[PDB]
Amino acid sequence: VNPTVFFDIAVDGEPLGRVSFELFADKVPKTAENFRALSTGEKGFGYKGSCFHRIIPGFMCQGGDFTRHNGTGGKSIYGEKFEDENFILKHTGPGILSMANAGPNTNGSQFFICTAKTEWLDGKHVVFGKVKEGMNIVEAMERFGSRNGKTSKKITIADCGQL
């Protein structure tokens, strides 16, 4: 069964709203479990307290660097990096949750949420989830993005866990 996780988003420390995701453990159980475990922090580390370092209106919101907090770090529950599980799922529209990477088989903890169709990323980033509730909060996060993704306010995951 597909688990459900949530982010409680804050803007400059002020609460913004909750986004929940369904994680497609039925198609990508390894990628889904990494995100699930990092959302609960049950391994001793995870997404709580980290920020969305890149928000580009019309495209996606990227975050997940909880080791360096500069957009270059992050790690998975399996080690520093793990392999691309498969590319069954595609970037079909807004709300898609997918793994950021720096080349083939360099998945860690960085992820992105699409705010539009990004089909040129298909076959290159592993899709593993979709926003279930709170797409308006993701849309609200775009108010603080920019052309190259620099955010004008600090957008953080104040809390997160499993539903």
Partner: protein, 168 residues
Amino acid sequence: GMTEYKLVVVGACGVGKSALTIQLIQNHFVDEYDPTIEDSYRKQVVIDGETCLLDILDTAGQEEYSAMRDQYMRTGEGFLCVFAINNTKSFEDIHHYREQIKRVKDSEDVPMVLVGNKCDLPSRTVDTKQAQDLARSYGIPFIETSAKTRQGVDDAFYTLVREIRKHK
């Protein structure tokens, strides 16, 4: 992907160009005066059932830099020409901005919208029919707005996008 529209907000200093833009982008009213050097913003919207990406340039109205408006006028696709309804001088500056944009673009047919901002203020000096006449004589739409109450904010930017689509 979705179409990207290059919008440029122009007008005299202090008329509310930045206030209008930040209301569009962040749904928040800046009541303090933070004079702009140059700022760019992005927002995806749905106008007439089609999604598009607004790229908005917030410009500087200072008169000392009027000979430097050339580059942004060349790349901009549509122009929001803002005056304040309580500032007669800003309404008179509109003519100079439009003439510049025509001269820079070498065209009489440039997508433009005339915006009378600060319509929440109790003492106007420019009358609504006066701006309507100038808009008619230009062949462009006119919209009264308030960045404070958000009146006509979405309308002004959306009407500019509609003007650009017809220009195609």
